Amino acid sequence: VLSPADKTNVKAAWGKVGAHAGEYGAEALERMFLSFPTTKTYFPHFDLSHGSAQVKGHGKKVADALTNAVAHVDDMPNALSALSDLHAHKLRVDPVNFKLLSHCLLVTLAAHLPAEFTPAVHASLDKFLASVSTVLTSKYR
């Protein structure tokens, strides 16, 4: 699903984010419960109020799980398997919500990396995030 060039623009953007991931995660997250509210039922305990040390340590778990993927790009199924069973069996996240987050996650990059966010990187980032989604929502039984 991901061609040679696609993988290139990915790393291209992980880099110029590097260790900022941990934030952009939370930032991409807060953009979500703030843009599409339905997504809130998945986090019943949480305080989705701005700044939350919850939404901040979560975005790291996220952004790092992605790095793991940008790393294991030629094989995400098995490398993301631990995560695929939290979202498909335990959490039962509606595939829809992923399209939502891959979108928020994408608006963060666009507004923190105006030089890298290029029409073709933009694209490659979608296929990437799309491919991540497909893996975390695959296992359903």
Binding site: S35, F36, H103, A111, P119, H122
Partner: protein, 146 residues
């Protein structure tokens, strides 16, 4: 089709800083580029076979203008998006056969082009507000399928 005062604000305040001429082409291209099958509707536009072939394509700009046009159009008529986009609706559905999901795509690429051009200015409170409008327009557009 109901956004709070808070929202009405940000929306019109950042659309006033929008290059009505170039964000429209910037969007329609980012569409044909991230959602490649949307090209099949612009055959008579020639070259598109490469990100920049598209990003520089002139018709791809002349058109992205009238598109980012109806948007601004609707934005004045927030509380009757159906009316505002009636004829524009029957066209893409009754005529051109543009599957209505693609509408929620162009609106989402759009929102993305904003984040780009306005950095931290485009804040979540801003996106939320806008997210609501993009959905509006899009649902508006698809009504002749409902």
């Amino acid at each position: 089709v109901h956004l709070t005062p808070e929202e009405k604000s940000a929306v019109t305040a950042l659309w006033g800083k929008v290059n009505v001429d170039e964000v429209g082409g910037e969007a329609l291209g980012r569409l044909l580029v991230v959602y490649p099958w949307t090209q099949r509707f612009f055959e008579s536009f020639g070259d598109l076979s490469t990100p920049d072939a598209v990003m520089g394509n002139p018709k791809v700009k002349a058109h992205g203008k009238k598109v980012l046009g109806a948007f601004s159009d609707g934005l004045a008529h927030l509380d009757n998006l159906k009316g505002t986009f009636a004829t524009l609706s029957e066209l893409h559905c009754d005529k051109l056969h543009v599957d209505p999901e693609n509408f929620r795509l162009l609106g989402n690429v759009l929102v993305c082009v904003l984040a780009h051009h306005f950095g931290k200015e485009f804040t979540p409170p801003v996106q939320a507000a806008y997210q609501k409008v993009v959905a509006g327009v899009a649902n508006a557009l698809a009504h002749k399928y409902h």
